[PDB]
Structure formats: C-alpha cells, structure tokens
Write a protein that holds these residues in place. Structure first.
Motif, PDB file in Angstrom:
ATOM      1  N   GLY A  51       0.808  -1.218   0.000  1.00 13.08           N
ATOM      2  CA  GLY A  51       0.000   0.000   0.000  1.00 13.08           C
ATOM      3  C   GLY A  51       0.842   1.270   0.000  1.00 13.08           C
ATOM      4  O   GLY A  51       0.313   2.359   0.339  1.00 13.08           O
ATOM      5  N   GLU A  52       2.100   1.142  -0.405  1.00 11.89           N
ATOM      6  CA  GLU A  52       3.000   2.307  -0.442  1.00 11.89           C
ATOM      7  C   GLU A  52       2.812   3.175  -1.680  1.00 11.89           C
ATOM      8  O   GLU A  52       2.690   2.627  -2.798  1.00 11.89           O
ATOM      9  CB  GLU A  52       4.488   1.895  -0.372  1.00 11.89           C
ATOM     10  CG  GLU A  52       4.878   1.252   0.973  1.00 11.89           C
ATOM     11  CD  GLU A  52       5.091   2.359   1.997  1.00 11.89           C
ATOM     12  OE1 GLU A  52       4.803   3.551   1.715  1.00 11.89           O
ATOM     13  OE2 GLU A  52       5.894   2.154   2.937  1.00 11.89           O
ATOM     14  N   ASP A  53       3.051   4.455  -1.500  1.00 11.86           N
ATOM     15  CA  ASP A  53       3.354   5.387  -2.576  1.00 11.86           C
ATOM     16  C   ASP A  53       4.641   6.140  -2.254  1.00 11.86           C
ATOM     17  O   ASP A  53       5.740   5.673  -2.654  1.00 11.86           O
ATOM     18  CB  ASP A  53       2.199   6.360  -2.831  1.00 11.86           C
ATOM     19  CG  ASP A  53       2.531   7.163  -4.075  1.00 11.86           C
ATOM     20  OD1 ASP A  53       2.921   6.592  -5.115  1.00 11.86           O
ATOM     21  OD2 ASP A  53       2.291   8.387  -4.118  1.00 11.86           O
ATOM     22  N   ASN A  54       4.564   7.086  -1.336  1.00 13.49           N
ATOM     23  CA  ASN A  54       5.769   7.675  -0.772  1.00 13.49           C
ATOM     24  C   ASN A  54       6.370   6.778   0.313  1.00 13.49           C
ATOM     25  O   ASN A  54       5.720   6.550   1.366  1.00 13.49           O
ATOM     26  CB  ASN A  54       5.505   9.082  -0.235  1.00 13.49           C
ATOM     27  CG  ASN A  54       6.830   9.812  -0.003  1.00 13.49           C
ATOM     28  OD1 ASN A  54       7.732   9.317   0.721  1.00 13.49           O
ATOM     29  ND2 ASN A  54       6.859  11.053  -0.444  1.00 13.49           N
ATOM     30  N   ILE A  55       7.498   6.172   0.012  1.00 12.56           N
ATOM     31  CA  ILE A  55       8.148   5.245   0.954  1.00 12.56           C
ATOM     32  C   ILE A  55       8.807   5.911   2.162  1.00 12.56           C
ATOM     33  O   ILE A  55       9.256   5.188   3.087  1.00 12.56           O
ATOM     34  CB  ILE A  55       9.189   4.339   0.264  1.00 12.56           C
ATOM     35  CG1 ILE A  55      10.321   5.138  -0.408  1.00 12.56           C
ATOM     36  CG2 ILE A  55       8.540   3.292  -0.668  1.00 12.56           C
ATOM     37  CD1 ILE A  55      11.387   4.183  -0.973  1.00 12.56           C
ATOM     38  N   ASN A  56       8.845   7.229   2.182  1.00 13.52           N
ATOM     39  CA  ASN A  56       9.413   7.986   3.290  1.00 13.52           C
ATOM     40  C   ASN A  56       8.347   8.625   4.166  1.00 13.52           C
ATOM     41  O   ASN A  56       8.703   9.133   5.261  1.00 13.52           O
ATOM     42  CB  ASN A  56      10.446   9.038   2.836  1.00 13.52           C
ATOM     43  CG  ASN A  56      11.807   8.382   2.579  1.00 13.52           C
ATOM     44  OD1 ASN A  56      12.206   7.442   3.306  1.00 13.52           O
ATOM     45  ND2 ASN A  56      12.506   8.880   1.581  1.00 13.52           N
ATOM     46  N   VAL A  57       7.093   8.608   3.729  1.00 17.20           N
ATOM     47  CA  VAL A  57       6.000   9.134   4.568  1.00 17.20           C
ATOM     48  C   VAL A  57       4.793   8.219   4.740  1.00 17.20           C
ATOM     49  O   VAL A  57       4.377   7.542   3.775  1.00 17.20           O
ATOM     50  CB  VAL A  57       5.643  10.598   4.204  1.00 17.20           C
ATOM     51  CG1 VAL A  57       6.529  11.293   3.159  1.00 17.20           C
ATOM     52  CG2 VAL A  57       4.173  11.076   4.289  1.00 17.20           C
ATOM     53  N   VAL A  58       4.304   8.130   5.960  1.00 15.71           N
ATOM     54  CA  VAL A  58       3.122   7.333   6.251  1.00 15.71           C
ATOM     55  C   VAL A  58       1.865   8.089   5.831  1.00 15.71           C
ATOM     56  O   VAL A  58       1.601   9.208   6.348  1.00 15.71           O
ATOM     57  CB  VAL A  58       3.071   6.963   7.746  1.00 15.71           C
ATOM     58  CG1 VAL A  58       1.758   6.264   8.144  1.00 15.71           C
ATOM     59  CG2 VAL A  58       4.290   6.107   8.116  1.00 15.71           C
ATOM     60  N   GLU A  59       1.304   7.612   4.731  1.00 14.24           N
ATOM     61  CA  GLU A  59       0.194   8.280   4.050  1.00 14.24           C
ATOM     62  C   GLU A  59      -1.156   7.649   4.324  1.00 14.24           C
ATOM     63  O   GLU A  59      -2.196   8.286   4.029  1.00 14.24           O
ATOM     64  CB  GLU A  59       0.419   8.326   2.534  1.00 14.24           C
ATOM     65  CG  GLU A  59       1.736   9.046   2.206  1.00 14.24           C
ATOM     66  CD  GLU A  59       1.872   9.151   0.695  1.00 14.24           C
ATOM     67  OE1 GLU A  59       2.204   8.156   0.006  1.00 14.24           O
ATOM     68  OE2 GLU A  59       1.731  10.267   0.143  1.00 14.24           O
ATOM     69  N   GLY A  60      -1.173   6.500   4.938  1.00 15.83           N
ATOM     70  CA  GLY A  60      -2.469   6.009   5.429  1.00 15.83           C
ATOM     71  C   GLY A  60      -2.955   4.694   4.854  1.00 15.83           C
ATOM     72  O   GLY A  60      -3.976   4.166   5.355  1.00 15.83           O
ATOM     73  N   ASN A  61      -2.381   4.247   3.771  1.00 19.17           N
ATOM     74  CA  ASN A  61      -2.833   3.002   3.139  1.00 19.17           C
ATOM     75  C   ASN A  61      -1.843   1.843   3.298  1.00 19.17           C
ATOM     76  O   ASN A  61      -2.035   0.770   2.679  1.00 19.17           O
ATOM     77  CB  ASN A  61      -3.093   3.207   1.637  1.00 19.17           C
ATOM     78  CG  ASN A  61      -4.206   4.236   1.464  1.00 19.17           C
ATOM     79  OD1 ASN A  61      -5.345   3.916   1.877  1.00 19.17           O
ATOM     80  ND2 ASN A  61      -3.788   5.492   1.406  1.00 19.17           N
ATOM     81  N   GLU A  62      -0.803   2.056   4.074  1.00 20.06           N
ATOM     82  CA  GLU A  62       0.252   1.043   4.271  1.00 20.06           C
ATOM     83  C   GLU A  62      -0.170  -0.155   5.115  1.00 20.06           C
ATOM     84  O   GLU A  62      -0.832   0.029   6.166  1.00 20.06           O
ATOM     85  CB  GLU A  62       1.528   1.642   4.903  1.00 20.06           C
ATOM     86  CG  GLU A  62       2.191   2.737   4.045  1.00 20.06           C
ATOM     87  CD  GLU A  62       1.661   4.133   4.374  1.00 20.06           C
ATOM     88  OE1 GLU A  62       0.648   4.321   5.113  1.00 20.06           O
ATOM     89  OE2 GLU A  62       2.309   5.128   3.971  1.00 20.06           O
ATOM     90  N   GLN A  63       0.398  -1.289   4.775  1.00 22.56           N
ATOM     91  CA  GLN A  63       0.457  -2.498   5.607  1.00 22.56           C
ATOM     92  C   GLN A  63       1.889  -3.027   5.681  1.00 22.56           C
ATOM     93  O   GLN A  63       2.486  -3.347   4.622  1.00 22.56           O
ATOM     94  CB  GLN A  63      -0.440  -3.613   5.048  1.00 22.56           C
ATOM     95  CG  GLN A  63      -1.911  -3.176   5.021  1.00 22.56           C
ATOM     96  CD  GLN A  63      -2.743  -4.278   4.387  1.00 22.56           C
ATOM     97  OE1 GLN A  63      -2.678  -5.443   4.839  1.00 22.56           O
ATOM     98  NE2 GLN A  63      -3.612  -3.873   3.499  1.00 22.56           N
TER      99      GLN A  63
END
Ligand SMILES: [Ca+2]
Length: 223
Positions: A51-63
């Motif tokens: 669920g990454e886009d920006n790998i340096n910021v937690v944007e909300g869709n990560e697992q």
C-alpha cells in the motif's frame, strides 16, 4: 525507473516494497500471504511494505508485514542470473482492498510486441544517482528473442526476456529489482538485470514468470 512517469498513489496495487531498514527491492503480491521477487534480492530480516506510494512518509494506506519464510528457486545461479526468482511468505495475511490487491499469474507467455507496465522506486538517472520517494511507472514493449540475444550475446536463457527500447532513454534501474512487469493484467516479468540503465542497445532483462507458474503453485500449496 528512467524516463518514466509518476504512477500516482495506489494505482499499482500489487506493488510491494522490500524493507530491511530501507527500501532495497520491489516485489509483487500474488495472494494475501505471498510475494514474488528476484532471487538476487534475497536478504534475511525482510519486512514487506504494502500500500505504499511515498516510501518515506506514512500516508495512510500502508500495511507492514514481516516475512515468515523465503524460498529462492532451487536452480538459481547468481553468476548468470538464470532462474532469478524468489517467493516470500508473509507472517500474516494482507488485507486486500482496491488499493492493495494481488496480481494474477499468467496462463500463457506474452509475446514480443506486447506492451507492459514496469514500476518501482529505483534510480531515475542513467548517469548519476537520484532516487524518487514515490512510485515510478514505465510502459514498454516486450522485444523479440532475436533482438534480445543480439543485444546480450551468450547471456540470454529461455527463462529471460528483454523489454524496453533499443534506443535507450527508458528503462528499469537499480532499486527496481524484483519488481513487476505486468502485461494485459497478468504478471509476466520480474525486474532482473541489464548492462547499466537506459543505455543504447542495452535493454532491461526480466525473469520470464510464465516458465515458473507450476513451481509457484506447488510451493504455495505446500508451504
Ligand atoms: Ca508511505
């Protein structure tokens, strides 16, 4: 990715980042518990990032899920990069939505002339170093066997294909390794190797996933 475009957040829902304190390789989610990558990406202590886009910021869709088990292809040759494919089982099953999905395994091998989508967080320069924080995408054709073997004499095996542009300018690069090549909604390739990036007459070389489907299914069924 050199000479590509910014995919857009979660537009490539099967794209994984492999993290060991940092992003080192890509991968593809092939079901809720399994990831396929390149055998040359093998490390201990992998965390799979979905669920990454920006790998340096937690944007909300990560697992963020740790790997339970990693299986390198029994015939992987690190000198030739023949059979450059690896399976990674997650400690827990991923929660699959529109933004985090699996990609289908092929039924058939894709032919030369087929347009594919290649994506990753790798270097964007053919000369020098510049790593993006967001997912980059590239649409590229599968080249003929002939053109491939003529670009890389003595180096291409049955388990490889070339994709990209013989003119150069557009390719995959360092850090894209292990990532997807998706043609007509199926996983056809894995970012494997090349001679530098985006250089003239030196296209990217990709693992030919259609040769491995039986191995993948058997392994997943028993592990
Ligand atoms: Ca993020």
């Amino acid at each position: 990715i050199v000479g590509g475009y910014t995919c857009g957040a979660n537009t490539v829902p099967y794209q994984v980042s492999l993290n060991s304190g940092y992003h080192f390789c890509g991968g593809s989610l092939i079901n809720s518990q399994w990831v396929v990558s390149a055998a040359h990406c093998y490390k201990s202590g992998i965390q799979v990032r979905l669920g990454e886009d920006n790998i340096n910021v937690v944007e909300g869709n990560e697992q963020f899920i740790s790997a339970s088990k990693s299986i390198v292809h029994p015939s992987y040759n690190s000198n030739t990069l023949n059979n450059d494919i690896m399976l990674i089982k997650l400690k827990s099953a991923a929660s699959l939505n529109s933004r985090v999905a699996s990609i289908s395994l092929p039924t058939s091998c894709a032919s030369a002339g087929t347009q594919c989508l290649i994506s990753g967080w790798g270097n964007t320069k053919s000369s020098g170093t510049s790593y993006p924080d967001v997912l980059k995408c590239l649409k590229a054709p599968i080249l003929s066997d002939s053109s491939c073997k003529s670009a890389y004499p003595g180096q291409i095996t049955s388990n490889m294909f070339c994709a990209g542009y013989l003119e150069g300018g557009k390719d995959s690069c360092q850090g894209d390794s292990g990532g997807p090549v998706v043609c007509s909604g199926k996983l056809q390739g894995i970012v494997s190797w090349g001679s530098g990036c985006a250089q003239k007459n030196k296209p990217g070389v990709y693992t030919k996933v259609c040769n491995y489907v039986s191995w993948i299914k058997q392994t997943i069924a028993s592990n």
